[PDB]
Ligand binder design. Sequence first.
Ligand SMILES: O=C(O)/C=C\Sc1ccccc1
Ligand SMILES: [Mg+2]
Length: 709
Amino acid sequence: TDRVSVGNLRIARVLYDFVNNEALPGTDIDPDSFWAGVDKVVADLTPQNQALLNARDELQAQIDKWHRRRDMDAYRQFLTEIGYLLPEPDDFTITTSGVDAEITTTAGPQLVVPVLNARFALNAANARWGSLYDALYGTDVIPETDGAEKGPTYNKVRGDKVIAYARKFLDDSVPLSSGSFGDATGFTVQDGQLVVALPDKSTGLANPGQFAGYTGAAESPTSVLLINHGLHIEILIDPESQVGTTDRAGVKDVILESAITTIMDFEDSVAAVDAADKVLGYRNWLGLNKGDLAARVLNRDRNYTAPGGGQFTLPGRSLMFVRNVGHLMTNDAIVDTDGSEVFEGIMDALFTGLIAIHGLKASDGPLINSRTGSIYIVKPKMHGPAEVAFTCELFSRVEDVLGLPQNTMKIGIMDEERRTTVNLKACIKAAADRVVFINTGFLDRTGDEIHTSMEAGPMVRKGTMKSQPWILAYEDHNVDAGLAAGFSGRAQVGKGMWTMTELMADMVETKIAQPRAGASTAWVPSPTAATLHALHYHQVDVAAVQQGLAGKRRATIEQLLTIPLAKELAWAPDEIREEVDNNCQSILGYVVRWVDQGVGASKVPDIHDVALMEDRATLRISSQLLANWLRHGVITSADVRASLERMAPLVDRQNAGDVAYRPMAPNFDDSIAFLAAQELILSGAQQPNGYTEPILHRRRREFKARAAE
Ligand SMILES: O=C(O)/C=C\Sc1ccccc1
Ligand SMILES: [Mg+2]
């Protein structure tokens, strides 16, 4: 047992103790009133939560039947008739208030990190200011060509390339009145303005307003602060340093404001299947909000002198969101009298919201998240406006339990399910006074696309999906809906993760497409990645881009509804086989770390040994594609078995560097991980909206139980 009785609820003792001892003290909430509200909110909202999941089922059955016995006009008309495609509401503007500047105004990189990893969470929180020299020297952005490779010790030829890259950036972002930063010799602050000594005549900024401050003596600054497109750049001056001595102006480093916000993830990047796991997560979220999390500690605020003369302070930390789990799953951290597990989304709202109160107070711990008095919650995997409204009502009720003013808890709406995509305007409307972002992505949305039209026929390959008509319309449609609902100057419009964590030259070259499309934020896989992607927001004036796009409708419903069916016999046998192996090793590589080790986010080599940093949604797309090919006779169940068999020892070799790893091959049926992977495929077509959590959670729980005996 080991549970506590609170009305109809039976709470895991480890959760009960954590909340009473760690979470509640200092919030001024009566403990007995807190738990009374938990029981009340759970009893009150559970039936509607269940009603909504049943409605997903009802709609998908109808669509399944439609396809089995079968143009856009009939299809569209059908979706409208069944309650899937809802009417578009009249124009409106969001009324969200109490929102920090990092979100309403500033455009820049956004980091996403598993909350259960204290070390990563700390680095993410501290990633708001990152070294441009480290990011350039340490990655392939500066070509590792002959003579410029990074060896065991510092290479000066490589470093001199790092320095020129940075000077080229400075010229491009904060131009001098005449000449370049490349030829500078010194920096002084004379009568409130920045003076750059060149080797002949000195010069000022072409736009004097880009000078934001300095440190050290005004006559010999230890650093110079600049600003461009709302993001700070800091030039550190120190000829008495490893790098500065070679620098013809004494510049030690260039620091960029990078990850201006971070999402602390409880959902797809973590493996948390029971009370003990949820508490580890909650404890870290609590450490972050208190400002006392340590593993390595949290950065404190940064002090500067204003150009005129007075002292000011800039936040030393990423502004934090938390991503709660979605509406589907239950978790036995709380069960009812009958033994039935409570919905995890309801619990996340209550517990992560309580904890977040600590981030709005200084002692007791030392640090603050939101100055403006908001709590930021990302809600994933919502399907349409009724599900958005339910979330907003959940937050309203939690706010009541916690004694917060209404609309304290803001919502970040992930557009990652088809029924949200096609009803986007109504979804934003349903959250008009709470919404602080919308964003798109590849993995979950493509998995939902596949599952929704499972019965329509064979889908194109996973690589091909990235450039299909439906997904390009999807991306444009999301921005369009945001801007037209007033997001510019008010709420973030965000795009998806760059997964290839080692291919930084490739990221810098191509991810710039995202701000060019009017996204004020985009996801990056690491602090180093945040620093490099920040370069893009200096080249692109996102605010100006968004102003350009307002009033334009770039996507039609037809384009959105365009199912990615393959053309008649698109593939040769070898291409069919490559795709199967690709998807089988995608599944195995991720599942083996999840089930065996409880790791939901890590650098995982793919079939071409490219390091990818993906979350659980990689399981959704890969298992759905294989289920689809199996459903329509593209491949056979023997083909799947054979592929899983071939790829397993390949995955084993990929995990050679791991101490705790236990190999799947040659004995597959003895491996819960392998069996989990096989089940995800063969049972894929039957999972609700193709979600993988039901199978995954069961298999990890099975692993944890066997390991206890
Ligand atoms: O990859 C990371 O840095 C952490 C996991 S979150 C995520 C990864 C891939 C796509 C979307 C989200
Ligand atoms: Mg997702």
